[PDB]
Design a protein around this nucleic acid. Structure first.
Ligand SMILES: Nc1nc2c(ncn2[C@@H]2O[C@H](COP(=O)(O)OP(=O)(O)OP(=O)(O)O)[C@@H](O)[C@H]2O)c(=O)[nH]1
Ligand SMILES: [Mg+2]
Ligand SMILES: [Mg+2]
Ligand SMILES: [Mg+2]
Ligand SMILES: [Mg+2]
Ligand SMILES: [Mg+2]
Ligand SMILES: [Mg+2]
Ligand SMILES: [Mg+2]
Ligand SMILES: [Mg+2]
Ligand SMILES: [Mg+2]
Ligand SMILES: [Mg+2]
Ligand SMILES: [Mg+2]
Ligand SMILES: [Mg+2]
Ligand SMILES: [Mg+2]
Ligand SMILES: [Mg+2]
Ligand SMILES: [Mg+2]
Ligand SMILES: [Mg+2]
Ligand SMILES: [Mg+2]
Ligand SMILES: [Mg+2]
Ligand SMILES: [Mg+2]
Ligand SMILES: [Mg+2]
Ligand SMILES: [Mg+2]
Lengths: 70, 684, 20, 51, 29, 368
RNA sequence: ACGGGGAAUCAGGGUUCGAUUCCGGAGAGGGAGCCUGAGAAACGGCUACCACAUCCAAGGAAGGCAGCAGGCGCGCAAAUUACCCACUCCCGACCCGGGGAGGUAGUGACGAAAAAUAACAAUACAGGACUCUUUCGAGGCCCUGUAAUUGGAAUGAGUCCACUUUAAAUCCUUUAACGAGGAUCCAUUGGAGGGCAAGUCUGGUGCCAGCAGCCGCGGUAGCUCCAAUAGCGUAUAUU
């Protein structure tokens, strides 16, 4: 649910196993996705993706370069 | 172009301002800010504290022990406490600190204690951190000094937010830091603002300024080992506190508060000190441990008296009977009732406004009532100096009291005194060398508590089954379940193997969050029952070794079985001549070298073992040395037990050989009946 | 008696792909 | 960037290993896996279709 | 064998977008 | 630290407060000075209901049944079916479920079998009409939040069935209900089972005759359920609900005597008496009706440490004892301030109840 | 919408930018007024009003960073409260005093220029490269490959003296001594592929397919290719 306007949207998590870093009621940063198109094995009609959680990039958490602050 | 470029930039800057709105519950008169000073053992922690005290109060204190409260500015006071290298204090101070001053030796570089404390703060709620690096007088104002500052700053920017402020202490004049550097450092402390941390906002807590023993002296003469009643003084922080409540004191145990009383606050701000007439006392420093400080029922006055000032063995019904019904036919009775009936902003801004209205109502609700009246309705508000009376304290606490070690009193919420089954999401730390074995003891730091338990490590499957794991995965999150105290969901936790002793490596074993609380674990383990073929009839084979009686086979009829090779089968019936043998049909023919097994799931259990850490109940020199249950590896070293490895379980090269098959055999009858064109032709 | 950080901590390489 | 996630995970190249026949059954022969059975399975199917 | 596979990979790339795949399937229908 | 109590009266609130507090309770001397000393069956039926909707509870009963020890576990929801005792109505058990439903681990889907309409306990129609909107004020609103009556039941036979579903919430929203407002409409519910359908019509024309002078808009619904839906005993009754501009609801209801005992009640008398009982409630009117006062006070205490206010009429003896139990279990003391209402001519004096909630969250809900 | 000299993009014509180190105008929280002076409707001058705001013994008194540093602008965040008038010039009674004007260093790959992370020889053992080809085939060789060994030359990153620089310094440039074989003194970012078990889920066309796989019985003491390269990606808007 976006903080600015209260709308509810569906986004992609980049990889399975990044779901473990994300918990419910967490604050995340969302960017756009899918202007170019949708790849094979991607669900059409979803136009958002999750980029950061607690202001930390998901790739840095996955690679073990940073730790999520509570 | 200018309109579009300017508009899109401001929207991006608004995104930084957005956050999850929460009700502001801070008091109108806040308590002193807690400032902790940590670092490697000989970095200069105590020197900086004396400079900060002299900077704000123009006073020099001798033999500082415990927290010190000073007035620093017109509207702000600070509580200053030094943190030692011991891991137990590092864990406690992180749970309470509002501001952290981290000291780095620039000449030597980073040390492990610096990175361990940052991980502790990340788990339990990240406070505001200002980094101070010292010992710059070793360098000689060249490339080497300039490059060292950049290298240390950019590595520090990874643990905290990028662009964080660092302070440099160039040199010591007469064993003291330069006044201008200290003055600038003190100025940034004055203007710092703080975010609402989840744990601190939810629970009331107290940092103790003074401890005093309240026992009859003749009781001590009778038995020294008697339980003792102790009085504690400190500022109330976090949330409201009730008169009768349960509080956990880390390092000692769980207690219930007998008596609570608000007290006139020492070291008040000078404006409030102006109101009370004084003979120029000029109180600016408070440190008692250092020694420097110190229709009848309808009426409200009767309805309130009746409630808060035969019936038993009677019917329980939530129905109010009418003792005196009105006539409802007279005009005046009809008269008394006729008046009843009818004759451009963001969503973030609007939600912030609603949070403000609720916060204004909370503060202004009981402002008219007296403080004694206020305590009954809302409890003790944060920011008041309070006196806490605790009974049944162990005697070893009083006789082994050390003023350096802080005393923290953390209020417990509902059901937090009870015990149950706790399920956690857990990941082994990246810098830890070893992995954690299930059914081995480990120390958890959760909530206010530090304790040792025995956890089970498990993994989730897509169907929803939780199956047991032998070890924590090296690179993945993992489920953890154990028997321990009840703790609210969404709180972080920290795992240590040994609090006693010093080791060169990183000491934090793992990190995670609390997910679920229950009374049943529902964790299961995989069990395979193995058998071997002894008689084979194409698809059907006779299997022995899986069972030992005909009653066993009857229970498992129709079960799915398979070979190591992957051929799937079904149990059909039990045979008679071997007691456990049975008949099974399969997809294809089996070989005698094949092995069959059946996949089963067996529920497991965990012992209920909970051993709290009691470091404060130790001699003053021995507060570091606390031990408990040992792990499997330690027990093997203590005894003469040596690991023995099964030859079957080891992995070995297979070395297979090329496979041949017989040529197809055509029956003699079929050869005769075949047409002349397609007959196998052999010349004799 | 000083516990210096390791090379792994000093350069948080993490899970970086291995290259020739 | 799914490629960056996959490439980081595939940094470790250890694969799972094969288990052998137990020692007390070593006289019987090698334990056959799915690859070994597939050879004898297709051979029998080929002959049956010819017959 | 590798050369034959690489030719099909180019055709697989030549429709790898989601809308491209649904494009032919209506057309083949 | 367990609490100790004596007697059989107020048994439900002692058990409900114990499981939310997490503190054990000891009950002693239950109907000691009686020919039947043990616990009644309907109280034993209530205890079995708690055991099914919780996980990990420990309950001890003496061989005589004079004492009860209850160690509460965590709340576990899910699908539950229960056969209620015919001595007390389903609404007797339903009030306790309304208190505990939002704090379950899983959303509760319960079907209750027993007697729906009775003279002793509140009707399930009243709880549907008035109690459910009150929980929506606290934020427990949901798509699956409903009460449905499958078949009606009357004593002594019983034979009724209701299904109740409630969402789970992590925290409760504070409320400030201080303005009652003026009554717009009156709605009613007239039912007859295993008798002539003419009974309901003879109830309607009696209640309407009294209430038409105060308000123009009154319409009473009539219900006749046939076959297995009728139940196992004959009876009839009326339930009345008043709706205000502010959204509050005030209700009253009456039911006929059972078949076994009591003289037959004229339907015209039942219609008039229920209407006068409703007008008695209006004279006492507040933001919540007298039956629902104890429910409102409990949900105020379970807020997220905020100031909340409710305006209610004269306090019932049930609520007065409920307030004392709240101080024993949750250590909360309300601030009471009566409102005179001298010349406003709204009726009797009202009481304004205000408090600050204790920090309470749903510990049973799973974080995922 | 401060204007211009100008910046970008074009075959041209044009189009889009120009708060921003040069020139001109205007203002000093907001509207008005005024003294001195050659020159001001001046604000690091004065008087009253409006809005803010500091001290007080409650009577009174003192204010204007859109100068240089520095702090704040819901809780979420990015240059030093540094050195000097040595250069350039300005003011004064003055060769000499003063100048956050200016100059000197510090500070986020935001932008531009140069440029490392190795070079050269040797030995041994194998027999197969490579190009075009929609699974068929056609050409072709003065070599290729080996996570195979071996040798003694060269050098700067760094460590550490001394000069030189400069107002004093730092940096750059000189220069004595140390400083390389896994030269582990170990370059990254994006894209695309392969490899696997008595492992898990889902669907079927008995033996299959999909998704995926550091999780297996026991046991806890560093694969390949492509694009760029000290650089390389993503989102929104647009041309
Ligand atoms: N030269 C120099 N020495 C410093 C500096 N800062 C701290 N020190 C040294 O630190 C010593 C003081 O030790 P402490 O004040 O006790 O610092 P600490 O980290 O609290 O040590 P413990 O009390 O043992 O925990 C002094 O004797 C100094 O030699 C610095 O900036 N420059
Ligand atoms: Mg010290
Ligand atoms: Mg303008
Ligand atoms: Mg311009
Ligand atoms: Mg001007
Ligand atoms: Mg301004
Ligand atoms: Mg002049
Ligand atoms: Mg002016
Ligand atoms: Mg100025
Ligand atoms: Mg000026
Ligand atoms: Mg400035
Ligand atoms: Mg700010
Ligand atoms: Mg000059
Ligand atoms: Mg001069
Ligand atoms: Mg300047
Ligand atoms: Mg960076
Ligand atoms: Mg960049
Ligand atoms: Mg930048
Ligand atoms: Mg460049
Ligand atoms: Mg010099
Ligand atoms: Mg060499
Ligand atoms: Mg498969």
């Amino acid at each position: 649910q976006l903080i600015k306007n209260g709308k509810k949207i569906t986004a992609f998590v980049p990889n399975d196993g990044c779901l473990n870093f994300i918990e419910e009621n967490d604050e995340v940063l969302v960017a756009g996705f899918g202007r170019k198109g949708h790849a094979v094995g991607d669900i059409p009609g979803v136009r958002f993706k999750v980029v950061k959680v607690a202001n930390v990039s998901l790739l840095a958490l996955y690679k073990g370069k940073k730790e999520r602050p509570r | 172009v200018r309109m579009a470029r300017s508009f899109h930039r401001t929207q991006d800057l608004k995104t930084k301002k957005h956050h999850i709105p929460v009700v502001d519950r801070t008091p109108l008169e806040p308590p002193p800010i807690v400032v902790v000073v940590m670092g490697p053992p000989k970095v200069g922690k105590s020197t900086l504290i004396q400079c900060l005290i002299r900077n704000f109060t123009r006073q020099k204190l001798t033999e500082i022990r415990g927290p010190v409260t000073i007035v620093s500015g017109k509207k702000r006071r600070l509580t200053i406490i030094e943190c030692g290298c011991d891991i137990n204090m590092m864990i406690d101070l992180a749970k309470v600190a509002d501001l952290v001053l981290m000291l780095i030796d620039a000449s030597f570089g980073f040390e492990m204690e610096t990175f361990e404390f940052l991980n502790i703060c990340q788990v339990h709620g990240f406070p505001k951190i200002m980094g101070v690096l010292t010992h710059l007088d070793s360098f000689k104002h060249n490339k080497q000094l300039k490059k060292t500052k950049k290298r240390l700053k950019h590595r520090f920017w990874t643990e905290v937010y990028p662009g964080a402020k660092l302070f440099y202490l160039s040199g010591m004049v007469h064993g003291e830091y330069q006044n201008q550097e200290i003055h600038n450092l003190g100025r940034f402390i004055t203007v710092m603002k703080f975010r609402p941390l989840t744990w601190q906002t939810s629970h009331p807590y107290i940092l103790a300024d003074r401890m005093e023993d309240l026992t009859n002296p003749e009781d001590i003469r009778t038995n020294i080992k008697c339980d003792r009643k102790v009085s504690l003084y400190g500022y109330l922080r976090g949330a409201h506190l009730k008169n009768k409540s349960q509080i956990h004191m880390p390092g000692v145990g769980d207690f219930a508060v007998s008596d609570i009383s608000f007290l006139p606050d020492p070291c008040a701000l000078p404006e409030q000190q102006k109101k009370r007439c004084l003979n120029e006392k000029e109180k600016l420093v408070y440190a008692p441990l250092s020694g420097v400080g110190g229709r009848q029922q309808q009426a409200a006055p009767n309805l309130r008296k009746l409630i808060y000032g035969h019936k038993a063995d009677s019917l329980d019904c939530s129905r109010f009977l009418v003792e005196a019904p009105h006539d409802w036919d007279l005009e005046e009775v009809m008269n008394s009732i006729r008046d009843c009936f009818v004759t451009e902003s963001t969503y973030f801004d609007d939600l912030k406004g609603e949070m403000q209205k609720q916060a204004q109502l909370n503060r202004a609700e009981f402002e008219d009532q007296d403080d004694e009246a206020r305590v009954q309705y809302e409890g003790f508000r944060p920011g008041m100096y309070v006196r806490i009376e605790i009974e049944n304290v162990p005697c070893e606490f009083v006789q082994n009291f050390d003023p350096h070690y802080p005393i923290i009193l953390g209020g417990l919420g509902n059901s937090e005194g009870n015990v149950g089954y706790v399920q956690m999401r857990l990941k082994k730390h990246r810098w830890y060398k070893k992995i954690l074995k299930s059914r081995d003891p480990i120390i958890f730091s959760v909530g206010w508590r530090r304790f040792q338990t025995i956890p089970l490590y498990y993994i989730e499957d897509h169907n929803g089954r939780q199956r047991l794991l032998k070890y924590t995965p090296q690179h993945m999150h993992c489920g953890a379940a154990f028997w321990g105290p009840i703790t609210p969901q969404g709180t972080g936790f920290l795992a240590i193997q040994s609090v006693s002793g010093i080791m060169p490596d990183f000491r934090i074993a793992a990190t995670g969050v609390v997910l679920d609380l229950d009374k049943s674990i529902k964790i299961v383990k995989k069990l395979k029952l193995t058998g071997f073929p002894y008689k084979i009839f194409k698809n059907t084979s006779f299997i022995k070794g899986m069972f030992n009686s005909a009653l066993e086979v009857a229970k498992f009829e129709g079960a799915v079985i398979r070979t190591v090779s992957g051929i799937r089968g079904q149990i059909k019936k039990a045979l008679r001549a071997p007691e456990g043998a049975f008949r099974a049909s399969f997809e294809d023919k089996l070989l005698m070298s094949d092995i069959v097994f059946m996949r089963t799931w067996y529920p497991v259990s965990i012992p209920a073992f909970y051993n709290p850490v009691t470091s404060l109940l130790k001699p003053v020199g021995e507060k570091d040395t606390w031990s408990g249950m040992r792990t499997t590896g330690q027990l093997r070293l203590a005894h003469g037990v040596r690991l023995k490895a099964n030859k079957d379980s080891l992995y070995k090269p297979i070395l297979r050989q090329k496979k041949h098959f017989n040529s197809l055999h055509i029956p003699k009858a079929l050869q005769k009946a075949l047409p002349f064109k397609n007959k196998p032709k052999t010349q004799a | 008696a000083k516990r210096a950080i390791t090379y792994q901590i000093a350069k948080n390489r993490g899970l970086t792909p291995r290259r020739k | 960037m799914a490629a960056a996630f996959r490439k980081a995970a595939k940094s470790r190249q250890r694969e799972h290993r094969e288990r052998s026949q137990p020692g007390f059954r070593k006289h019987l022969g090698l334990l056959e896996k799915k690859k070994d059975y597939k050879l004898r399975a297709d051979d029998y199917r080929k002959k049956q279709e010819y017959l | 064998k590798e050369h034959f596979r690489a030719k099909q990979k180019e055709e697989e790339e030549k429709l790898k977008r989601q809308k491209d795949l649904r494009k032919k399937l209506f057309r083949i229908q | 630290h367990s609490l100790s109590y004596a007697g059989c009266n107020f048994l439900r609130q002692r058990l409900v407060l114990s499981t939310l507090s997490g503190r054990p309770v000891k009950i002693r001397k239950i109907r000691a000075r009686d020919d039947n000393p043990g616990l009644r069956d309907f109280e034993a039926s209530f205890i079995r209901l708690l055991d099914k909707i919780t996980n990990g509870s420990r309950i001890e009963i003496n061989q005589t049944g004079t004492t009860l020890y209850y160690q509460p576990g965590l709340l576990y929801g899910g699908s539950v079916e229960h056969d209620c005792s015919v001595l007390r109505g389903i609404g007797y058990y339903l009030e306790s479920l309304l208190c505990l439903a939002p704090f379950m681990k899983h959303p509760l889907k319960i079907v209750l079998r027993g007697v729906t309409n009775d003279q002793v306990d509140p009707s399930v129609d009243v709880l549907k009409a008035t109690a459910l909107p009150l929980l929506k004020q606290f934020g427990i609103d949901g798509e699956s939040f409903e009460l449905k009556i499958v078949r009606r039941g009357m004593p002594p036979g019983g034979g009724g069935e209701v299904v109740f579903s409630c969402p789970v919430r992590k925290v409760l929203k504070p409320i400030q209900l201080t303005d009652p407002g003026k009554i717009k409409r009156i709605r009613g519910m007239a039912y007859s089972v295993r008798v002539s359908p003419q009974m309901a019509n003879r109830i309607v024309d009696s209640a309407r005759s009294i209430l038409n002078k105060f308000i123009p808009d009154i319409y009473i619904y009539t219900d006749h359920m046939k076959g297995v839906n009728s139940g196992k005993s004959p009876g009839f009754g009326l339930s009345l609900v008043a709706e205000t501009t502010s959204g509050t609801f005030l209700s009253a209801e009456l039911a006929s005597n059972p078949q076994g005992q009591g003289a037959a009640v004229l339907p015209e008398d039942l219609g008039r008496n229920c209407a006068r009982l409703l007008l008695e409630e209006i004279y006492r009117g507040g933001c919540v009706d007298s039956t629902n006062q104890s429910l409102a006070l409990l949900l105020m205490t379970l807020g997220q440490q905020d100031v909340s206010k409710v305006l209610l009429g004269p306090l019932s003896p049930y609520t007065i004892e409920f307030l004392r139990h709240l101080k024993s279990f949750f250590q909360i003391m309300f601030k009471i301030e009566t409102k005179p209402c001298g010349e406003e001519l709204k009726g009797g004096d009202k009481v304004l109840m205000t408090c600050v909630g204790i920090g309470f969250s749903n510990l049973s809900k799973t974080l995922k």
